[PDB]
Amino acid sequence: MKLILTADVDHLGSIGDTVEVKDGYGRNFLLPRGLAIVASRGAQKQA
Amino acid sequence: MAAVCDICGKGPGFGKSVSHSHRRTSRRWDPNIQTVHAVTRPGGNKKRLNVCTSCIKAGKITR
RNA sequence: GGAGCUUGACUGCGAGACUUACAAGUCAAGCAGGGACGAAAGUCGGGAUUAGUGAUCCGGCACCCCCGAGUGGAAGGGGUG
RNA sequence: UCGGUACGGUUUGUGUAGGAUAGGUGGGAGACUGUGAAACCUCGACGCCAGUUGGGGCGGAGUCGUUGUUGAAAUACCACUCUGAUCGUAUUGGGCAUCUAACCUCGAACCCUGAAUCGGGUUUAGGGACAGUGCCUGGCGGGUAGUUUAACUGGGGCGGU
RNA sequence: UACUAAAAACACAGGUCCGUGCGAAGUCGCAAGACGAUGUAUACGGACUGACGCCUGCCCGGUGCUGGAAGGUUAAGAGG
RNA sequence: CCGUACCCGUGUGUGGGCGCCCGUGACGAAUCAGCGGUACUAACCACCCAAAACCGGAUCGAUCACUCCCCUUCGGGGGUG
RNA sequence: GCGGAGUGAUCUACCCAUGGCCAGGGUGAAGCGCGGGUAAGACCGCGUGGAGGCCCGAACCCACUUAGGUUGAAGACUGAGGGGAUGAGCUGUGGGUAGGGGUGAAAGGCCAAUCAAACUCCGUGAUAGCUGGUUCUCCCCGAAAUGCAUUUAGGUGCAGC
RNA sequence: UAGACGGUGAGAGCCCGGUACGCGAAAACCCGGCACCUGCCUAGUAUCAAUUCCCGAGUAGCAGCGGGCCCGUGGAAUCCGCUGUGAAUCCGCCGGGACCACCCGGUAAGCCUAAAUACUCCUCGAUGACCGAUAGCGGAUUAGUACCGUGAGGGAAUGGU
RNA sequence: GGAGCUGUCAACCGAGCGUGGAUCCGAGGAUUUCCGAAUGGGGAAACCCAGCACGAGUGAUGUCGUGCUACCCGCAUCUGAAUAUAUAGGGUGCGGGAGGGAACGCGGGGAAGUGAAACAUCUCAGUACCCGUAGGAGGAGAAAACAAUUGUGAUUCCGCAAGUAGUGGCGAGCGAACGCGGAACAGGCUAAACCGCACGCAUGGGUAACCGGGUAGGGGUUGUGUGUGCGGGGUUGUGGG
């Protein structure tokens, strides 16, 4: 899963660098807490 | 838990059971419908929803 | 009973008969190829005869271009053993 | 932590030729001046006071291929040596230990319920990524369902065929 | 045992064992949810015997159960 | 139905009696300053049962590495240490 | 007889809440008090009092033997005799459990006169190698009950007539 | 343009109700026509270079378990459903009976679509080598009635002056 | 339409209407106790009992009459607790639905008896039967279909194809398709790329480099990107936008 990471997380790394979410960690830890969003069309906004 | 996915219609499939001796009988395939807490906004009521894993993959994903 | 050499304990056929409800079983001279024994004539399609066996379907090995779900191949199927 | 995939790296058994003991062979029968400097001192997996490889320091302009008494011994260039063992860069299975974040709790308080001991929501507290559940699969299983269990049978049965 | 059979059959008390640590075990229901129980090991469900008295012998081999992990065998999945 | 009782309810009536409203009586706030109590209680403290690591003694075994003598069919144990 | 869908706990079996009934006698526990007994206890004998899955015995519920009845007065009775009858009782009202299930102080009996799985409807014109039936006449001709094989010998196919 | 049927005291073209045939709708309804009202368009058609995007997504396809299509998992395609994993947008993807290269065909996972076809509670008009009261629907007559059954349900007879 | 009526069952009276058009036929309308989806609450159906509002009536409580008052879904809208945002809920209002129907259709569930000389696979059968669910017919449908080198050009239905190729404890039995000939023959709208806007999330909170393109200038301001939504455009396979 490719989420736009908006917070410094040890699991994934620096904000906006890359992402390798294991299809659920982000679902119940990043998306409800406001730490990352779904990379639907925000890849253009990030770069 | 097998009740029809509230937001898709993924009901149970019905069919037979091919035994080794072919004496078929009735069985059904229930979808993997799990009970999850569902919201409509950041920090909602978290009501309840028995929903299929395919919707956990796309659609009403909160938690 | 005994001795020498051999592998017909073969191939593709076999008119005509017996027998028999049917299936099934049984014998067959003689012919083509090729071979054994025989100097030859001739005998040999297992055991002196009758008992030693088991229909169909399905599946397996080898072989034969027989087909090959548009074509060329293959899977699979088919034929002989 | 154990065991793995890919890969950058000092790199590996006194079994036989012996300054030369890496299954083996090699853009080079040297990687130039462009390598961890045969000095004592002392010791790391092998440890055989023996070495391709060494193990830490250095009399800071040469070990030497081209000085083979051997498989042509000069590979800390190559096959990056089968590169174990290992120093680790990604990846990854199981188990091990913990957490909270899914999830679970006829565990407590509170809310249209002042109409309720059910429900539903919140907060709190505690289990906890287990369990339950779905798919697939193995086992068990006369508790359940459907059938079979031959014949002349000197009446039938036992017997025997 | 109405509608041939009332007993020497059944049954409780008593005496054992097994199981159950709590929305317990067991049953009803597919599940929810109930019963058990507004009870919780001196309680509850289940099996044999059937007051009291004396007693309840030998046997773990087969088949059951309860524990055990070396090995063997050992599906799916993984890998191939 | 004659006679005599009881219960619920409405409206009419008398006068009484109380209160509205005024008046009267009894309790009785409201802020500020001080001061308390700890009441909650950050911290911290007394007790307080538990205690992450590290060290240790024993525990058996159908676990395993080593060893004694005893056996063999060669696969395997004993009291042990 | 099998399957589906429905119907009945108004009789009966069990249970649940709620009211009632059980004449009149007999026996006379524990407890209490007195006296004896012992320092008390143990124990004995009295009075009140009155309990018992207590006794004999009515209503009442049952149905043990015999006789009667048995196209009965009655689709389960009567008469004369018996058992229980303050209790695990009886009985009415009210309600529920409903068919491969219920219930059952357990007989494989009760579930609307039928229970080794009720009834009705539908599947259904169920099926049977089995039994019974198969309707007017005339004319010609005229068998077998033998053999083979059969989850077959009481049937059927082929052969023979 | 009336000889269809029936009735009338017996077998009726000319006796009668009718038939043939022609008339016939204020009002309502249906159909159709006319006008109003409603509603769509200031074009992308054509020639071209092909730098870039797009043509239905947790879908397709794959694997496993099942269904069903003549097709009984079998060598088992197409189609549908469940469960995990999980792609691409024209040099694409799927199918053409395991499967693969080539070739033809059509571009899925979005919607709607009258006629042809089936059926008759009910209402018209007609027919009949259909019945004539034990037949025809069970019901010609107080018929799903009387009656039976706890009930679901079962379910008669009676025509003629 | 017209001179006789007051229905028949069962047929004897009584008293009346009518040529000024009765009886009778047909349509429309009004009324329409009570139960039943029954629905103001409740219920042994055809019984009882309430509330709101208006009005009649008694000297006043009682009583009567006419209207309203169930649930769920969806639409608009106020408030929107525990808990702050905020939602679920609650409140008010206007429509629709709720149950029947003789058969017929679709989707989905899903048997046994019988046959197989027993019988399990299997068949009888996806029938009977229950639910859902419509309609006057429905379903299916506009090729990711067939063919296999001639090509056809949406579907459905009757009849051939055929009781075939084939499938089956290869047993009982089951059972197509292509193609041909007929009936009726219609194919059309949406999503997406893009564009102009509203809502929404960030950035620039300024140098945005936009404001119909461009020219000469100006203001330099809402530029850019992105989610949702409205309206244009586009809707096709010899590929097309």
PDB file of C-alpha atoms (C1' of nucleotides) in Angstrom, chain G residues 12-87:
ATOM      1  C1'   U G  12     -53.523 -38.154  28.413  1.00  0.00           C
ATOM      2  C1'   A G  13     -47.655 -37.498  30.077  1.00  0.00           C
ATOM      3  C1'   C G  14     -44.514 -33.404  32.632  1.00  0.00           C
ATOM      4  C1'   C G  15     -43.942 -28.569  34.356  1.00  0.00           C
ATOM      5  C1'   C G  16     -45.291 -23.322  35.761  1.00  0.00           C
ATOM      6  C1'   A G  17     -48.273 -19.123  38.594  1.00  0.00           C
ATOM      7  C1'   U G  18     -52.732 -19.005  41.190  1.00  0.00           C
ATOM      8  C1'   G G  19     -57.453 -20.611  44.629  1.00  0.00           C
ATOM      9  C1'   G G  20     -59.761 -24.921  46.907  1.00  0.00           C
ATOM     10  C1'   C G  21     -60.731 -30.032  49.326  1.00  0.00           C
ATOM     11  C1'   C G  22     -59.321 -33.903  52.839  1.00  0.00           C
ATOM     12  C1'   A G  23     -65.749 -35.817  57.978  1.00  0.00           C
ATOM     13  C1'   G G  24     -64.640 -38.210  62.525  1.00  0.00           C
ATOM     14  C1'   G G  25     -61.466 -41.511  65.659  1.00  0.00           C
ATOM     15  C1'   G G  26     -56.647 -43.891  67.166  1.00  0.00           C
ATOM     16  C1'   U G  27     -51.170 -43.564  68.266  1.00  0.00           C
ATOM     17  C1'   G G  28     -48.868 -39.362  71.132  1.00  0.00           C
ATOM     18  C1'   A G  29     -41.979 -37.642  68.658  1.00  0.00           C
ATOM     19  C1'   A G  30     -38.776 -33.587  69.524  1.00  0.00           C
ATOM     20  C1'   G G  31     -39.155 -29.225  72.442  1.00  0.00           C
ATOM     21  C1'   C G  32     -40.980 -27.328  77.555  1.00  0.00           C
ATOM     22  C1'   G G  33     -41.708 -28.163  82.967  1.00  0.00           C
ATOM     23  C1'   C G  34     -41.597 -31.481  87.306  1.00  0.00           C
ATOM     24  C1'   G G  35     -39.335 -35.560  90.059  1.00  0.00           C
ATOM     25  C1'   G G  36     -35.431 -39.414  90.291  1.00  0.00           C
ATOM     26  C1'   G G  37     -30.187 -39.687  88.328  1.00  0.00           C
ATOM     27  C1'   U G  38     -24.984 -36.928  87.757  1.00  0.00           C
ATOM     28  C1'   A G  39     -20.811 -31.867  90.299  1.00  0.00           C
ATOM     29  C1'   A G  40     -23.300 -31.701  84.893  1.00  0.00           C
ATOM     30  C1'   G G  41     -24.101 -35.149  81.007  1.00  0.00           C
ATOM     31  C1'   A G  42     -25.857 -39.999  79.883  1.00  0.00           C
ATOM     32  C1'   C G  43     -30.485 -42.135  81.760  1.00  0.00           C
ATOM     33  C1'   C G  44     -35.736 -43.203  83.810  1.00  0.00           C
ATOM     34  C1'   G G  45     -40.920 -42.087  84.941  1.00  0.00           C
ATOM     35  C1'   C G  46     -44.830 -38.322  84.587  1.00  0.00           C
ATOM     36  C1'   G G  47     -48.148 -33.646  82.872  1.00  0.00           C
ATOM     37  C1'   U G  48     -49.111 -29.997  78.996  1.00  0.00           C
ATOM     38  C1'   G G  49     -48.393 -29.934  73.867  1.00  0.00           C
ATOM     39  C1'   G G  50     -48.602 -32.181  69.219  1.00  0.00           C
ATOM     40  C1'   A G  51     -45.154 -33.733  64.786  1.00  0.00           C
ATOM     41  C1'   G G  52     -45.429 -38.095  61.258  1.00  0.00           C
ATOM     42  C1'   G G  53     -43.680 -39.434  52.726  1.00  0.00           C
ATOM     43  C1'   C G  54     -47.890 -42.781  60.757  1.00  0.00           C
ATOM     44  C1'   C G  55     -52.398 -46.591  61.565  1.00  0.00           C
ATOM     45  C1'   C G  56     -57.813 -48.315  60.968  1.00  0.00           C
ATOM     46  C1'   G G  57     -61.516 -45.735  58.278  1.00  0.00           C
ATOM     47  C1'   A G  58     -65.648 -41.697  54.794  1.00  0.00           C
ATOM     48  C1'   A G  59     -66.070 -38.003  50.598  1.00  0.00           C
ATOM     49  C1'   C G  60     -62.496 -37.971  46.730  1.00  0.00           C
ATOM     50  C1'   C G  61     -58.627 -40.076  42.958  1.00  0.00           C
ATOM     51  C1'   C G  62     -57.509 -44.980  41.567  1.00  0.00           C
ATOM     52  C1'   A G  63     -58.644 -50.115  39.137  1.00  0.00           C
ATOM     53  C1'   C G  64     -55.904 -55.579  42.933  1.00  0.00           C
ATOM     54  C1'   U G  65     -58.930 -60.492  42.728  1.00  0.00           C
ATOM     55  C1'   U G  66     -63.565 -62.742  41.382  1.00  0.00           C
ATOM     56  C1'   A G  67     -68.569 -62.802  39.078  1.00  0.00           C
ATOM     57  C1'   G G  68     -71.576 -60.258  35.449  1.00  0.00           C
ATOM     58  C1'   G G  69     -71.647 -57.882  30.597  1.00  0.00           C
ATOM     59  C1'   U G  70     -68.987 -58.940  25.970  1.00  0.00           C
ATOM     60  C1'   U G  71     -74.017 -57.432  17.713  1.00  0.00           C
ATOM     61  C1'   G G  72     -72.917 -55.058  26.036  1.00  0.00           C
ATOM     62  C1'   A G  73     -76.778 -50.397  29.830  1.00  0.00           C
ATOM     63  C1'   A G  74     -71.493 -48.600  28.080  1.00  0.00           C
ATOM     64  C1'   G G  75     -65.926 -48.303  21.524  1.00  0.00           C
ATOM     65  C1'   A G  76     -63.257 -50.085  28.492  1.00  0.00           C
ATOM     66  C1'   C G  77     -68.630 -50.267  32.540  1.00  0.00           C
ATOM     67  C1'   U G  78     -71.359 -52.204  36.918  1.00  0.00           C
ATOM     68  C1'   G G  79     -72.151 -54.928  41.659  1.00  0.00           C
ATOM     69  C1'   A G  80     -70.075 -57.093  46.010  1.00  0.00           C
ATOM     70  C1'   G G  81     -65.226 -56.823  48.137  1.00  0.00           C
ATOM     71  C1'   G G  82     -60.049 -54.023  48.311  1.00  0.00           C
ATOM     72  C1'   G G  83     -55.289 -50.130  48.301  1.00  0.00           C
ATOM     73  C1'   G G  84     -54.004 -44.596  49.373  1.00  0.00           C
ATOM     74  C1'   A G  85     -56.670 -41.067  51.979  1.00  0.00           C
ATOM     75  C1'   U G  86     -51.894 -34.222  55.969  1.00  0.00           C
ATOM     76  C1'   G G  87     -49.495 -35.960  51.390  1.00  0.00           C
TER      77        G G  87
END
